[PDB]
Design a protein around this ligand. Structure first.
Ligand SMILES: *[C@@H]1O[C@H](CO)[C@@H](O[C@@H]2O[C@H](CO)[C@@H](O)[C@H](O)[C@H]2NC(C)=O)[C@H](O)[C@H]1NC(C)=O
Lengths: 47, 49
């Protein structure tokens, strides 16, 4: 969240592992820029 | 010619108190009561509230 702009970068890839995130390297291209101008100090996921 | 009224147009507002200055392009529409003194306001307006 920079100057009220919310930047969301994303990336996906198939994996086969059940312990933790696999070791490797990849790049997360930008996907969304949102003009919220909204204060941010907390977040929470939803599953 | 558009926004003024003979009796006074009060529909336009401005924020008078805030704990800190705004960052660029920030938008604050909160209506939290500002405690200007040492007495807690508890959401009640008044002296220093
Ligand atoms: C966004 O809101 C947070 C509140 O969560 C502000 O941080 C607070 O700033 C006051 C200033 O005195 C502190 O007393 C609080 O302890 C702070 N709280 C947290 C969680 O950091 C923050 O300043 C606000 N920023 C903008 C740009 O609006």
């Amino acid at each position: 969240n920079i100057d009220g702009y919310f930047k969301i970068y994303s990336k996906h890839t198939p994996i086969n592992l059940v312990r933790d995130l696999p070791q490797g390297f990849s790049a997360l291209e930008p996907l969304v820029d949102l003009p919220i101008g909204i204060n941010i100090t907390r977040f929470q996921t939803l599953l | 010619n558009l926004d003024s009224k003979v009796g006074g147009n009060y529909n336009y507002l401005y924020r008078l108190f805030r704990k800190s200055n705004l960052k660029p392009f920030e938008r604050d529409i909160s209506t939290e009561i500002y405690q200007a003194g040492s007495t807690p306001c508890n959401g009640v307006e008044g002296f220093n509230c």
